[PDB]
Structure 1
Amino acid sequence: LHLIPPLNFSMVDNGIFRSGFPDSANFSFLQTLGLRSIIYLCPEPYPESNLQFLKSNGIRLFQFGIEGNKEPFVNIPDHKIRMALKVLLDEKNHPVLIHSKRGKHRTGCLVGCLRKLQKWCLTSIFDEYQRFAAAKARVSDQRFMEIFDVSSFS
């Protein structure tokens, strides 16, 4: 036994994964996925360790830096989520890992908006969001998904 998936790692769909921030202990696991792409949702620069892993493995980094904010005073990062969705929906970028810091809020919102495009009823989207967010589930994240207009992606 030796592979360590990154924090809160899960398969979302064919060619799509979610997690928190990978560190060097996770690189041997991430190698088994044959990633083409990472969608990174934090504003902080990528560490040198991570950049060397991407360069060694031919993985493209897409960064859409969403500022972390806590309830009750939240950002509505609509443009950044939609830019990340545009990349996520292009199969040429697959396999793709979506990650933020812990993979609960920013990652959860992007995945929830994907589920809405996949025609999941809201309660099913929120159940999946809650499974990762656990005691840190935010009503604001779920309201963002409730309000999200799918029009431009149909």
Structure 2
Amino acid sequence: ELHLIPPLNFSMVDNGIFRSGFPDSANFSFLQTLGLRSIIYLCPEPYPESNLQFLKSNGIRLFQFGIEGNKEPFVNIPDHKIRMALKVLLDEKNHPVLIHCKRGKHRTGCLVGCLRKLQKWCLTSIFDEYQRFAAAKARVSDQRFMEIFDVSSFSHI
């Protein structure tokens, strides 16, 4: 009866935009209900065969911008990779789009926080949303990345 299983830390960010951790086959019938056009994938690892077959069967485009895992206090969020992902995210032709890496907290959290900065949200509101997903794994380096992210080159879009 209660048969749909959203992926780990699943949320709707905006019209046509979702965030989560890594979907597995248990999550595919739920993802099918969203009519996705795109996945923005932020892990460096190759997409598993299971997931590739799901994308092929559903006509979903895979955009990969691989960000290596880092531990505090040595967090290094690659600005270029976040900005390449943001360029894809802001094109409505890619929507509906699911953003994911592993847990839906860090790489995912940074990309969504930078979108919120472009949407003119105050930093405390951006940080509150970031912290809601990251919970006990909230990182000051992820919020610092958002604090200094220069929105100049995206301001026109």
Same fold (TM over 0.5): yes
Assess if the C-alpha contact under 8 Å between 2:38 and 2:97 holds in 1. yes
CA deviation digits over 1:44-86, x for unaligned, max 9? 0000000000000000000000001011011131000000000
> In the aligned structure 2, how far is the partner of 1:51 from the partner of 1:14?
25
SS at match of 1:98: strand
> In the aligned structure 1, how far is the partner of 2:27 from the partner of 2:77?
31
Unaligned residue ranges in structure 2 (runs of 5+): none
Assess if the C-alpha contact under 8 Å between 2:65 and 2:81 holds in 1. yes
Identity %: 99
Which contiguous aligned blocks of 4+ residues in structure 1 show a shift greater than 3 angstroms?
none
> In the aligned structure 2, how far is the partner of 1:94 from the partner of 1:73?
34
> In the aligned structure 2, how far is the partner of 1:52 from the partner of 1:12?
26
SS at match of 2:93: helix
TM-score, L = length of structure 1: 0.99
> In the aligned structure 1, how far is the partner of 2:91 from the partner of 2:77?
24
Cross-structure match for 1:150? 151
> In the aligned structure 1, how far is the partner of 2:92 from the partner of 2:77?
27
Deviation at 1:92, TM superposition (A): 0.1
The number of aligned residues is 154
> In the aligned structure 2, how far is the partner of 1:36 from the partner of 1:76?
26
> In the aligned structure 2, how far is the partner of 1:59 from the partner of 1:31?
10
> In the aligned structure 2, how far is the partner of 1:76 from the partner of 1:20?
18
CA deviation digits over 1:4-57, x for unaligned, max 9? 000000000000000000000000000000000000000000000000000000
CA deviation digits over 1:67-122, x for unaligned, max 9? 01011011131000000000000000000000010000000000000000000000
Structural RMSD (CA)? 0.4
SS at match of 2:147: helix
> In the aligned structure 1, how far is the partner of 2:142 from the partner of 2:81?
14
> In the aligned structure 1, how far is the partner of 2:77 from the partner of 2:35?
33
> In the aligned structure 2, how far is the partner of 1:145 from the partner of 1:4?
31
Unaligned residue ranges in structure 1 (runs of 5+): none
SS at match of 2:130: helix
SS at match of 1:68: coil
> In the aligned structure 2, how far is the partner of 1:149 from the partner of 1:47?
34
Say whether 1:45 aligns with 2:75: no
